[PDB]
Amino acid sequence: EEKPKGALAVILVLTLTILVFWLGVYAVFFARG
Amino acid sequence: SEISRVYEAYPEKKATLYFLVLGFLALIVGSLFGPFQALNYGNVDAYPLLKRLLPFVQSYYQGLTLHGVLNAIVFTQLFAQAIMVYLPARELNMRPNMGLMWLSWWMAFIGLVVAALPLLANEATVLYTFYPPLKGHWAFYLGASVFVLSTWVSIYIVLDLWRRWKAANPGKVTPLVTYMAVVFWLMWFLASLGLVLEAVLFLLPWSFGLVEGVDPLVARTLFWWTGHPIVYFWLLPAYAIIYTILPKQAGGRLVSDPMARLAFLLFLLLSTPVGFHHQFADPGIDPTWKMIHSVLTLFVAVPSLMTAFTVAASLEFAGRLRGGRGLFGWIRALPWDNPAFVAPVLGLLGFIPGGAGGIVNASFTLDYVVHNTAWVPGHFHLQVASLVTLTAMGSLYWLLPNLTGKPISDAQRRLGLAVVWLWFLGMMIMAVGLHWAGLLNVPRRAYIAQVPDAYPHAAVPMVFNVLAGIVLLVALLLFIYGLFSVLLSRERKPELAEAPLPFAEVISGPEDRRLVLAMDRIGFWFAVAAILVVLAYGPTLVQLFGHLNPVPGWRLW
Amino acid sequence: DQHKAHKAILAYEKGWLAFSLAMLFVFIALIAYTLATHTAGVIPAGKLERVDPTTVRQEGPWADPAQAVVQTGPNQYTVYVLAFAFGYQPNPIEVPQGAEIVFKITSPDVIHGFHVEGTNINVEVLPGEVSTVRYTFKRPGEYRIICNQYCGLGHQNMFGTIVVKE
Ligand code: HAS
Ligand code: HEM
Numbered sequence: 001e002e003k004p005k006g007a008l009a010v011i012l013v014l015t016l017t018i019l020v021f022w023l024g025v026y027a028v029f030f031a032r033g
Numbered sequence: 034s035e036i037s038r039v040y041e042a043y044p045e046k047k048a049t050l051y052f053l054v055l056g057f058l059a060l061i062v063g064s065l066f067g068p069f070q071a072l073n074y075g076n077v078d079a080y081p082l083l084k085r086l087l088p089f090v091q092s093y094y095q096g097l098t099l100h101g102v103l104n105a106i107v108f109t110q111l112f113a114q115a116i117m118v119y120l121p122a123r124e125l126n127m128r129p130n131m132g133l134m135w136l137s138w139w140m141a142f143i144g145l146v147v148a149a150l151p152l153l154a155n156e157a158t159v160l161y162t163f164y165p166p167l168k169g170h171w172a173f174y175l176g177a178s179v180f181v182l183s184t185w186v187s188i189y190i191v192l193d194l195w196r197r198w199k200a201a202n203p204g205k206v207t208p209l210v211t212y213m214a215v216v217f218w219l220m221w222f223l224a225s226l227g228l229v230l231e232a233v234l235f236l237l238p239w240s241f242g243l244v245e246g247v248d249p250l251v252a253r254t255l256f257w258w259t260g261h262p263i264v265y266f267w268l269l270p271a272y273a274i275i276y277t278i279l280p281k282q283a284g285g286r287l288v289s290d291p292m293a294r295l296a297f298l299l300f301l302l303l304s305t306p307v308g309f310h311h312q313f314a315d316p317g318i319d320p321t322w323k324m325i326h327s328v329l330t331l332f333v334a335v336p337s338l339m340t341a342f343t344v345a346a347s348l349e350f351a352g353r354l355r356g357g358r359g360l361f362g363w364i365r366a367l368p369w370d371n372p373a374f375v376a377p378v379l380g381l382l383g384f385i386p387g388g389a390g391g392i393v394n395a396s397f398t399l400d401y402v403v404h405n406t407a408w409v410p411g412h413f414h415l416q417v418a419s420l421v422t423l424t425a426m427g428s429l430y431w432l433l434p435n436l437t438g439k440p441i442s443d444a445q446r447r448l449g450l451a452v453v454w455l456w457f458l459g460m461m462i463m464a465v466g467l468h469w470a471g472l473l474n475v476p477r478r479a480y481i482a483q484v485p486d487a488y489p490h491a492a493v494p495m496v497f498n499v500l501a502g503i504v505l506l507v508a509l510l511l512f513i514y515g516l517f518s519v520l521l522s523r524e525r526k527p528e529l530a531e532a533p534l535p536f537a538e539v540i541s542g543p544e545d546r547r548l549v550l551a552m553d554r555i556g557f558w559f560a561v562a563a564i565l566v567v568l569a570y571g572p573t574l575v576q577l578f579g580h581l582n583p584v585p586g587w588r589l590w
Numbered sequence: 591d592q593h594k595a596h597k598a599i600l601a602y603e604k605g606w607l608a609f610s611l612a613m614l615f616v617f618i619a620l621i622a623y624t625l626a627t628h629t630a631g632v633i634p635a636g637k638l639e640r641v642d643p644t645t646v647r648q649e650g651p652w653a654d655p656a657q658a659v660v661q662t663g664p665n666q667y668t669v670y671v672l673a674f675a676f677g678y679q680p681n682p683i684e685v686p687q688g689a690e691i692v693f694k695i696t697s698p699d700v701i702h703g704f705h706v707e708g709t710n711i712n713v714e715v716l717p718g719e720v721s722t723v724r725y726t727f728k729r730p731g732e733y734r735i736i737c738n739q740y741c742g743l744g745h746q747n748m749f750g751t752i753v754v755k756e
């Protein structure tokens with residue numbers, strides 16, 4: 001029928017998660033030199 | 034010598050019942066020490082309430098060492114051995130080579146009781162890792178090193194069914210579920226090598242007086258070779274349960290036998306060469322062999338990112354089919370009342386902060402921020418303690434009738450899914466305290482209850498773990514209470530004990546059999562494979578088997 | 591419906607699978623950028639360096655804990671450090687600010703961790719090897735060495751101390 005908008009949203013969340021996560025810990029690793 | 038015609042006409046419907054039930058026992062024991070360890074990191078010393086409640090137990094660490102082996106190694110592999118065998122069977126209908134599929138269970142057992150004895154003694158109280166130089170008992174590295182070998186039989190038995198079917202059906206591709214259990218089983222040999230290597234060529238002789246020392250750079254380089262892939266082992270079976278059984282539990286269909294076949298392909302090629310991710314903090318291994326694994330490691334993430342979409346898209350078709358409203362109406366539509374559905378979906382949920390942390394973990398240098406802190410046991414709880422665990426815990430509520438016959442009473446069901454909702458709630462919170470504590474630097478594996486002002490900036494998350502321990506405790510008891518009623522009730526309604534296995538249909542297209550037909554040269558890959566294990570661990574297991582510097586063992590407990 | 595939406599469930603798959611490799615590369619980029627600056631000073635030194643544990647608290651750099659610090663450059667100081675079952679040697683290690691510190695840790699005994707609370711200094715120490723790391727404490731304080739790798743019952747208690755002076 002179309003776009004699986006739902007699954008797009010599910011993989012949209014994993015993406016903000018897989019980022020906020022990676023991204024904050026990059027900050028933490030640079031704060032620590 | 035049987036009754037239930039059920040087993041006289043399929044007896045591996047039992048070589049599967051036991052493997053499975055040795056498995057959840059092993060869970061019950063371990064997952065006990067857990068509520069207690071939670072409270073530890075909650076900064077609360079409940080270990081004397083424990084010490085006397087099982088005075089066979091000496092140190093906090095005697096526990097973690099139980100909690101580790103039994104849960105990560107025992108319960109998981111035993112579950113890989115119920116599902117990753119018995120499924121390929123019923124999909125080909127063929128009877129697994131029932132002898133070999135029975136030297137398996139008996140093996141497992143003695144290996145388990147061999148390595149239990151010293152373990153409930155204190156003669157191997159050396160963490161799930163059994164890292165050299167701390168030495169263990171002789172009975173530890175045999176037991177364990179017997180237990181693991183069990184799976185090898187299994188590899189046969191499956192590879193066995195795989196070729197009786199290839200040939201009794203010549204030119205028809207491999208079925209989907211067997212095609213999982215094939216590349217999955219073939220992926221485990223090419224991994225296990227490592228730890229079998231380090232058992233044959235190291236732990237065993239030196240566990241037996243046959244040298245006075247182990248080099249640990251290799252004893253722990255060789256151990257991660259197995260050490261990674263293994264989790265994928267821990268994991269891929271419930272990907273299978275999730276790819277090919279959740280959809281139709283949801284009232285949907287896997288929407289691509291191809292995309293699933295590709296996952297499992299990519300898992301074979303990539304779960305074996307990534308071990309140095311474990312070794313970032315180890316020295317003696319070069320920065321580039323390091324860096325070479327960090328990217329491979331980010332690659333193996335490409336199967337799980339995909340499994341995500343395929344499953345979401347898939348829950349959703351199913352969700353709409355059953356009245357699926359607007360942008361999230363699909364969620365509210367699903368079988369939220371059936372734990373075979375809820376257990377893995379809650380699993381898959383917090384599998385989001387799961388993999389994300391994973392991708393931190395593997396991003397080479399970032400590992401220095403989190404390596405050996407609460408962060409890691411927080412990360413794996415999301416993964417094994419929870420997706421894997423709940424996917425198996427929840428796979429009782431349909432695979433258990435289908436293997437005994439006691440169906441699930443609307444008592445049991447509605448218990449089935451409180452157990453499931455606390456474990457998941459428990460795991461989330463625990464997860465938050467653990468990841469946070471770690472970010473503050475609480476080390477892991479540490480009886481921090483007993484150096485109880487050392488970690489004062491971890492106040493409020495320590496509260497989260499307290500909260501967690503209580504909740505998982507309830508949850509675990511509630512679990513015991515309820516596993517026990519469905520292999521104990523003396524109902525025996527055998528007809529749905531022959532319901533064949535709720536496999537989904539498989540939303541099939543045109544651009545299948547090109548691609549599908551590409552990933553079926555099992556062979557070409559099973560070697561593209563090897564070439565990879567070799568190219569990566571090749572260079573080091575040599576700058577290394579050449580500077581064998583072993584040192585003597587110890588026993589600081 | 592169903593065969594309209596598998597000519598759509600695979601397209602999106604690479605809408606997605608493309609993106610995911612895109613995103614995963616920005617990562618190996620950013621990972622190497624780190625591998626460019628100082629920061630990756632912390633990476634265990636890779637080229638091997640075998641030594642003996644039963645005799646290291648006997649001869650060689652590791653037996654007199656106050657010979658630990660040794661100016662090995664214009665701006666560098668080396669600290670030979672000893673993580674042993676249930677403490678570190680020296681305690682405190684004293685070292686300068688602005689100054690590149692090459693740590694070279696090792697064991698008389700079991701594997702240990704040398705985890706410098708507040709820095710990126712985090713590194714396995716195997717009885718048999720010389721875990722070599724370099725770090726530039728740009729800021730005075732006493733820091734806390736944390737053992738973060740099980741070595742039997744002493745472990746929750748195994749801490750050391752760094753003092754980088756002004
Ligand atoms: C059971 C097991 C495990 C899985 C699976 C697992 C996955 C990964 N892990 Fe891990 N791990 C590491 C990296 C990864 C990566 C990159 C993956 C990847 O496979 C992760 C990929 C995951 C994703 C890419 C997310 C996919 C999301 C999905 C698939 C959910 C979709 C949602 C749906 C479908 C539902 C929505 C539904 C609705 C109804 C709305 C690294 C380092 O790079 C370390 C060591 C760090 C250190 O320094 O010690 C590590 C440490 C561990 C340890 C500790 C070992 C020890 O004791 O020393 C364990 C036990 C463990 C387990 C497991 N791990 N891991
Ligand atoms: C309520 C249930 C559970 C709780 C509360 C729990 C909690 C914990 C905690 C707090 C630790 C940290 C130990 C430490 O670093 O001191 C740990 C260890 C660990 N857990 Fe669990 N866990 C539970 C269930 C499980 C399950 C089901 C599995 C397997 C799927 C599992 C696998 C592991 C492994 C492999 C370790 C590593 C400990 C080691 O040897 O370092 N846990 N657990």
Ligand code: CUA
Nearest residue numbers: 737739741745
């Ligand atoms: Cu030394 Cu833990």
Ligand SMILES: [Cu+]
Nearest residue numbers: 260261310311
């Ligand atoms: Cu791994």
